[PDB]
Amino acid sequence: LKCKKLVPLFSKTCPAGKNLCYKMFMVAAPHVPVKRGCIDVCPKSSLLVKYVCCNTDKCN
């Protein structure tokens, strides 16, 4: 499982524990990411920010 990091240049493979990819963006522009990292348990979303999780390579 290899996804992109905060910077759309360097990639890292989620180590043992995390097998999902998390992405943080504003509930307005889905084509406009903000942060990107790995995660284990998909957190909850808010009315402001939204954390979409996916179980695919280079999803976030």
Side-chain angles (χ1 to χ4, degrees):
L1 289 129
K2 75 193 182 180
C3 270
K4 302 193 87 83
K5 297 222 100 178
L6 276 86
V7 187
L9 276 157
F10 279 87
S11 39
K12 216 84 186 291
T13 274
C14 317
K18 305 167 171 181
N19 296 321
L20 289 168
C21 288
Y22 90 69
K23 85 193 292 187
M24 193 187 125
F25 64 102
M26 282 100 81
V27 66
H31 188 245
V32 177
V34 185
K35 302 132 171 279
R36 303 187 227 75
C38 286
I39 204 148
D40 170 37
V41 76
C42 194
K44 210 69 156 177
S45 274
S46 86
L47 286 73
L48 210 177
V49 308
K50 228 90 170 276
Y51 293 95
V52 157
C53 317
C54 20
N55 55 298
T56 38
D57 294 275
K58 300 187 83 178
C59 90
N60 65 336

